[PDB]
Design a binder for this molecule. Structure first.
Ligand code: ZN
Ligand code: ZN
Ligand code: ZN
Ligand code: ZN
Ligand code: ZN
Ligand code: ZN
Ligand code: ZN
Ligand code: ZN
Lengths: 133, 133
């Protein structure tokens, strides 16, 4: 299965809890907390406890299958890494998260780093915003 | 420069017109027509004729630097390929194009193809829609 390959490529043994959580992440909320995953699983009548959900998502994060972000300061969001790249705009007053991808900034980041003798390994860009209105 | 590397990797000699058009594509309209690129260039007081803009965008398309799409049936849209992956929803009545990326569908496409003995080289998914309202 595709999930099995993803887990193996990530140096992680294939297990039922690991497969169900990855499937939950695949189907979307784009930015889910550990509780959102747990609640979705419980709705689906599954049998995975919250602590296990958090543990697995942390295993996925360390492995590179997911990225963990904290946009409102008070909770962690976990989202797949495999998906197309996206940086984020966060509405400070409401907590609304808006993904974006600007090719100009992406190429400028590469230029900045390369002209210094480096290679860009990863990056994080968050723009905190408020409606002009 | 980053543009130079992109052009060379694509087996395309570096030229002024090729560099300016790629820069126009980098800075955004996410889905520009040849005329949109030409008009943007003219606004920027540049000196690239429309036929040259179309030719270069077609050179970029063949090379894989851009993908050409025809969403409303009557005009070609050119967008970078390098950007994160995105499929599209198109509002049939207005022509509005909405990008989306669903990890569930992406993994299901891979599963469908792999279980048949193939490797997925590329794909195109367009969902034509109308507001339920
Ligand atoms: Zn929160
Ligand atoms: Zn970025
Ligand atoms: Zn995101
Ligand atoms: Zn720039
Ligand atoms: Zn048109
Ligand atoms: Zn797709
Ligand atoms: Zn697009
Ligand atoms: Zn599915």
């Amino acid at each position: 299965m595709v999930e099995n390959s993803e887990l193996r490529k990530a140096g992680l043994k294939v297990t039922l809890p690991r497969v169900k959580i990855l499937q939950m992440l695949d189907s979307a909320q784009r930015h889910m907390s550990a509780e959102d995953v747990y609640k979705a699983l419980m709705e689906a009548g599954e049998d995975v406890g919250l602590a296990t959900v958090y543990r697995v998502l942390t295993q996925f994060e360390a492995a590179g299958l997911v990225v963990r972000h904290n946009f409102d300061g008070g909770h962690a969001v976990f989202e797949l890494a495999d998906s197309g790249h996206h940086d984020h705009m966060v509405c400070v007053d409401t907590g609304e998260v808006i993904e974006f991808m600007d090719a100009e900034i992406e190429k400028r980041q590469k230029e900045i780093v390369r002209e210094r003798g480096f290679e860009l390994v990863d990056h994080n860009l968050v723009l905190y915003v408020r409606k002009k209105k």
